[PDB]
Symmetry: D2
Subunit: 474 residues, 4 copies
Amino acid sequence: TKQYKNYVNGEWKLSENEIKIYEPASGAELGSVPAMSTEEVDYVYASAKKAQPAWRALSYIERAAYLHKVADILMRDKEKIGAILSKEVAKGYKSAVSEVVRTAEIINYAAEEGLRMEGEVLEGGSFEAASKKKIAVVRREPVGLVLAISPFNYPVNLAGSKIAPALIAGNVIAFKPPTQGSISGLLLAEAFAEAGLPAGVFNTITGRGSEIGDYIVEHQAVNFINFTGSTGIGERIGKMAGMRPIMLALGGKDSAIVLEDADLELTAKNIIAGAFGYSGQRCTAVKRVLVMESVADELVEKIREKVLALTIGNPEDDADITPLIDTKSADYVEGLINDANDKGATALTEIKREGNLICPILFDKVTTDMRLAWEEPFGPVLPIIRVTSVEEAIEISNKSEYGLQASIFTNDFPRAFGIAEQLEVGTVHINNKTQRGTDNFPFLGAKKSGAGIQGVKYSIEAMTTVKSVVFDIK
Amino acid sequence: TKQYKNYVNGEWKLSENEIKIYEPASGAELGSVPAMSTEEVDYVYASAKKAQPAWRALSYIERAAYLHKVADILMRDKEKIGAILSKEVAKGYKSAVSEVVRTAEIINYAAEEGLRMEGEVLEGGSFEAASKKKIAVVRREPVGLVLAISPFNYPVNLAGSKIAPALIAGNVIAFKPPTQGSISGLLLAEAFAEAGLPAGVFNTITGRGSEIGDYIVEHQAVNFINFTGSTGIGERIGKMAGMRPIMLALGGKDSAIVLEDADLELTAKNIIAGAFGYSGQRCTAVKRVLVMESVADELVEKIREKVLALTIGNPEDDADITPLIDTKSADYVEGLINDANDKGATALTEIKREGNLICPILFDKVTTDMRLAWEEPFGPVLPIIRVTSVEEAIEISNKSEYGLQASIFTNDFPRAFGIAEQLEVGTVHINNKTQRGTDNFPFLGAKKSGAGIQGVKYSIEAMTTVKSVVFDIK
Amino acid sequence: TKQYKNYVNGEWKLSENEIKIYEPASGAELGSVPAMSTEEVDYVYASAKKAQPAWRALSYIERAAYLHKVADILMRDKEKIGAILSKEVAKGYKSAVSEVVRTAEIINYAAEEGLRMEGEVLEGGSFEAASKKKIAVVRREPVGLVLAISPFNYPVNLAGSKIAPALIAGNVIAFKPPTQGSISGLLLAEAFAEAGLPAGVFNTITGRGSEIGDYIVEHQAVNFINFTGSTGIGERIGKMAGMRPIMLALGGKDSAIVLEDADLELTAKNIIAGAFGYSGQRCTAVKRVLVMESVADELVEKIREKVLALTIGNPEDDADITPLIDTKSADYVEGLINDANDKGATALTEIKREGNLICPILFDKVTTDMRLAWEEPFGPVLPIIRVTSVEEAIEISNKSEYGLQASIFTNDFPRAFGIAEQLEVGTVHINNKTQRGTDNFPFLGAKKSGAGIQGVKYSIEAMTTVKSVVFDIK
Amino acid sequence: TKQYKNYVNGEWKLSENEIKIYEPASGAELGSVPAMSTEEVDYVYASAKKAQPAWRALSYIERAAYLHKVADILMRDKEKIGAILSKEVAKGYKSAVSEVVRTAEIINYAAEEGLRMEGEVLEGGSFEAASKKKIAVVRREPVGLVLAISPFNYPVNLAGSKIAPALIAGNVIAFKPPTQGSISGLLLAEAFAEAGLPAGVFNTITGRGSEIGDYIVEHQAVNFINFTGSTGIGERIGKMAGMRPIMLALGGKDSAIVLEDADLELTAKNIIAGAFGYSGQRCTAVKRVLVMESVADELVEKIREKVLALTIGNPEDDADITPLIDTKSADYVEGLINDANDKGATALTEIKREGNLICPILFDKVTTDMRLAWEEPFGPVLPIIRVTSVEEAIEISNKSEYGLQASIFTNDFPRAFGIAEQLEVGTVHINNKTQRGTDNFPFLGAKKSGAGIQGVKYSIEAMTTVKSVVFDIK
Ligand SMILES: NC(=O)c1ccc[n+]([C@@H]2O[C@H](COP(=O)([O-])OP(=O)(O)OC[C@H]3O[C@@H](n4cnc5c(N)ncnc54)[C@H](OP(=O)(O)O)[C@@H]3O)[C@@H](O)[C@H]2O)c1
Ligand SMILES: NC(=O)c1ccc[n+]([C@@H]2O[C@H](COP(=O)([O-])OP(=O)(O)OC[C@H]3O[C@@H](n4cnc5c(N)ncnc54)[C@H](OP(=O)(O)O)[C@@H]3O)[C@@H](O)[C@H]2O)c1
Ligand SMILES: NC(=O)c1ccc[n+]([C@@H]2O[C@H](COP(=O)([O-])OP(=O)(O)OC[C@H]3O[C@@H](n4cnc5c(N)ncnc54)[C@H](OP(=O)(O)O)[C@@H]3O)[C@@H](O)[C@H]2O)c1
């Protein structure tokens, strides 16, 4: 077993204890990652705080450079990383490589967006005559040490989207990847080491969050917690954060609202691509379709067919639907499938599980009484809820505790815009599937789908504070 | 008993229980405010939530017109409200009227700043050539129900600063003034009532924070908590907030760094005003002078001299130093004073307390051993700490858990900017006492001094989220 | 004859020579305006320049107060001023009052928009590491003396649209209204004089442009020339401006592109309103309908009918169509009508001219060989051109030397956006008549329709410049 | 002879005629450049206009990629190009290399700054309630064909600073380098050619500016003229621009204001570097020192010494002072030296001219009566003017018809700022020599020093317009 080390204060370290990582699809052993001790966690943080001042004293262009190099390295090794990554989280090899390319892109972009952050000069005279000679020179500054924590479905991409924005602004990082993905995370950590950033600027932490999780979050060394993951852990992070700044990208139950005048063929393709992408293990996936009755039968039919075209199989074969992350997860989905069924839902696709590989199932005639109408599966299961009016679609849509994104399919644009304003989500895509898509675009969840606004530009803004220097003109 | 009432969903309501409020200076009864029950709190939030949609559906200019109407009413009644506020929190009459005027100004300014908030249009083609025809139309939206909590030292001003920004953006309000100052808060409600805002858009909650504070804060109807008060309560707010956004303005121990080249007269004049305004009961007060040894003697004598010119007395006489808010505080301050004296600090004034009226006291040669060096007094007690370099002054300054604002008196502006970057504070004033001064300016606190960035423009930004609508161009 | 006086350096001055103004509709004498000498113009500019420094020395808020005051005065006198305006430019009384009200709104809006202009702080370290301590504090400053020249169709509104934005930023104004409209212009001046703006900050000039026009514009005292008029004069001013900044709002031949999926009823209402508003004497009027052959017939009929419901008559009666500004215009318009009629266009209405009152005429099947297809009429004449594709409509549209605004009537917005990108105009309205509408919006013309970007905020940035103060932080 | 070709429509073309360019220092034949006919210019534009649409159709990131490549080419061949450039305009070989590096830097930066241009969404409801559902989606668009004309002192740098911002935004360029510098210009063109930018996107025009000058500018294909050169040709470009947008970077007489409390050694070093850089052949440069009598003798002496340390000679030997660009300029400068001399000026340095090489001369006691006090020499001659008050220094400084930049040397910053507000210039450097310094900073001149605001970000803004799409939400 290859025993990986954590990049800490400019060195690769192991821990007295470790964790063995396996392949969800095969079961093969990929290696082990350290299981840090609070003492070791304390070292990572003590290291970062000590390097922060020097890292911040650098010019924006110097930090941008280190970051571009990192991206250069990731592009160079997009094959090695994708290889492991693909195996570590059972993600299609091609898409796995793509995630690394997406990561490189986000890093380069953040580097360039961040070196152009500008300040403001406010006039006292705008508020009171007596203060006309008083001005405020407001410049942005880092919050200090940022604790980045990534999910299993994008251990690298959702690591960089937090790290790059943090570093360019002058913050130091403590990256805790998901255990089931800790290898991929350490591979990313490799690029940062090779790039040669100063020791302590970028560090990693591994170990089941189920034992050092609260510790790394509650540690007073952290000035900001940027997290993507379950809504459950999200809640707790919010409470442990106290009054400290936080970034939370949690679950979602994105609805696809289909009006009578929609382009059913296009709607169907988008709903297919979004719902089943990566077996439904995507936060922004199309997890529920709210379709008008008059066009339901036809739409459903289109979906069904296109579902059959999906490729069921293993990661190395770039199959649309691959084995779910783990057994627990698959069991969860099955529970939702059984509940939908017993209550009347009609499965138009075959319900079938083999290992942790669940075949894509299309549930029609789903009602708000079924768990599947609400709970986030994170498995290939798409329920279809029929409505008799846009207004109903709005209610059912907002009734959810989730509000990441929503889709609206219709040809009546002005109306879609009106409906978008009413949806309790961050982003509404018109005649397209939901997606974080275009990382410069803002990405945020409403209600229990998140806290804070992501998207390169917004992430930088989020992980920086302001320092205002006021004086009077003579 | 003159019984004041809360403004709830367009009507004035008493509660089965009340709390008698007395003048801190004279001890005379001022009236009573309701001691709301949780049921009543529930009805307030329910009211605000039910009113939010219609309030948001209005145009910005319409919401603006309402705020201007409130501001005009406050200006018209500046003598009325000022007179009572003066008595309720033992604040000079003139500065009390002044507090009201400043409130109308904030209200007016928020109305205009907010009616012209703009959205952005992002290019998908900026990130990937493949999305060149995809654009993101991003517009600001209200977060919902905002809970505003003001402090005793500015029950009206620090209410308007949260309320107007919140309301202009389309949020609805629940205003909880401090108990000692609740009558002033209810007088402010009068202005919103007379202005005619739709029932539910604006509401008040009164009652002992030690008995309904947790409840009004932990309530899930609250989408955002904007609070100004003690760090202790502030911390609890942070945790009770969970993942919900917050605005915290807390304690402060603003240091005034005085270099060898500082204009000692200007420095003493500024330090006297900032340290003793309203008897030191200010968050942005100059609460500790870090001055180079070589100019200490001269500076200290200028302070001592000006301190003795401060008037001591009653609010109606517009005295500089008035009785402290209550007995607990006067005790706490006197204890800080005695601890200094007993530990050896060099007192430049006689230690004197008449009831809750503590005469301005100045302690020179205070050491890091003395409580007065760190604890926020919120009384007219000013410590002087002699340093032998800017490096040390910066260390002492940052040693504090507070980091609201800082003053730097020197003639070397480039150096002042260098020092400013090192000081862990929100704002740094050069050759001027610290101050929230000019409300368009950002107002924030580092470390334990706060969370979030205030100042009209920033408050609106803080209490709004973004709604991103994405679509492809044909 | 009531002798009107120009307002110069805080004084109401007459001129040795006067120009009599007659009511276009009745021919009745309305009064007379001064006929300044080149030297009297020199005194206007000398005063302005002399008062500029002290005007700029004021705080932003103080200048805003003066403007707000002017606005209030105009609201109070809307009827008084409106009545004269109506008589002077043959604009319907009600819409004449509307111009005044709209003017106060712009004045007020510019006031609040202008006091909120902010500065920027640029980091040298964004460009080169060696300059990481160098920062640029950039703040806006006025350009100096601004010459504002308004048009006859909005002598007051297109006056304030330039004046207020210019004054708030700290510039001084020399306002030259149109001779036929000067009385209204001077009435506006009254509102400034009464507002009590410092002498010389605001001034007026009157005289035949065909005599002192080149002078007022060529005078080197003028720092910025903000103009709205004919493309002919507009170009002369362009060359006379030299390298000095300018604002040109010129002619337009806004086209209304009607696709096959357009709501024809809504399409017809908008075409009629935008085409015949003020008898077509609008720069943003609908002046040519490019409609797909298949819906041509149906659309044409809807229009023909709506045109007939238009009231025709005198301004005092608020008639839709009133006498044109002068006999020259009426002659020219008739000439364009006869050319179309003689060349074969299909008139859907009768040709009828009574004095300078031309009845609303509609020509269908207008070909590219007919003058009415390109020349801006500025009369109640509307050409309807049939096309066979969107590509053709786009071609006919851009072939024009004009490019102010355009309208697209369709049920497909994404396509409308793609077409808008192709149209060489400033603003594209979807399912709505073209319009300068909502003055905070940008207003600009491509090709020969204008230079510079108007709209309150943009006007302010146009008539201000930047002052960059660069220094190094120690 | 070494004959260069123009890069037209993606091909290298010669003309029936040509112009031979000789090394300003050795008089050797560097080579020849085409002397295009008007018909050949017509082809360059017809080609550019033809490629424009497809160039714009590309995504922002794609256009940025092309630019980055061009920058890469330049860095690879920096020595190859610096060699030729150094020879073409007789400038130190090292700085000739730096100019190329600076060019690559601006190009890379422009591509990144420009790929992030964002639009705005304006709310109708901000101006009137009736238009609350009306919004304006405002996006930036390129003006079309941009004509770039660079100066002799920076044939490469001041070309890229116009081309890149222009191109990234979607415009096509027609680059007209100065005859004396056309070889370098064409060398740059090679990088663009090797980068593979679509034919017609980037084109070059060579020929005597006195022959084809007015033609290329007046040509109607040009939508924008971005020019850097003499105030003389600038004024003409102004008129010939008509109403089309223009960017003018003309000459300057940057004053260096020295106060009594300045750091004379620091001041002097700065003045030496700024006034004599590139033999003073720079638009931004200390061309006049306005120093308080009090420290004039001391400052003068320091400058005097530092002048003697300056090297004299060939560009190949990186001498500080090189031969002026041509006989004419040297004749002109010498004339200024004589007028100043015959009027009383004291030359503290040997007035010596050998060929077109003038030794650095420092003139003391220069009065406002000497040509040298006002005219831009573009030679190694520094006049010194003794003033007795800041007020005077401000008055003299502003009496200049130039207003590019200024320098204030003092330790009283609040005062420096106050003074900077009064100086009629674009940028004011405190305790630093004037410079375009750090290209992201704004760069502009007042009065006769320019028109438009440069600096990467501002250049892009300048060469783009706006397209506004308005519609009503439903
Ligand atoms: N109730 C629901 O609706 C729902 C929905 C989806 C998932 N889940 C839960 O999520 C898990 C599997 O799904 P998932 O992998 O996407 O989610 P998850 O593992 O819960 O995601 C939480 C992320 O936070 C880290 N973490 C765990 N405990 C932490 C703590 N105390 N403090 C800070 N960080 C901590 C984890 O690291 P490690 O990887 O090292 O543990 C993990 O990367 C299961 O336990 C499942 O029950 C619940
Ligand atoms: N932790 C510290 O560092 C610190 C320092 C100085 C003073 N204090 C405490 O502050 C008080 C006097 O100073 P102060 O008036 O400036 O501060 P404070 O009273 O603590 O200010 C807190 C404000 O929040 C309200 N509040 C109280 N408990 C709350 C809760 N659980 N949830 C939400 N809101 C709550 C209060 O309303 P009511 O007015 O109705 O109570 C008060 O207006 C004393 O009780 C003192 O012990 C704490
Ligand atoms: N309506 C039509 O169909 C039509 C057709 C052809 C020509 N016209 C001509 O257009 C004019 C009426 O239309 P309009 O008012 O919209 O356009 P315009 O009068 O051309 O508008 C130009 C504005 O600039 C002023 N001005 C005149 N000469 C100037 C100069 N040399 N330099 C600077 N400013 C100058 C004018 O003032 P004054 O008011 O003092 O002139 C007027 O306010 C008449 O002159 C008419 O002969 C009209």
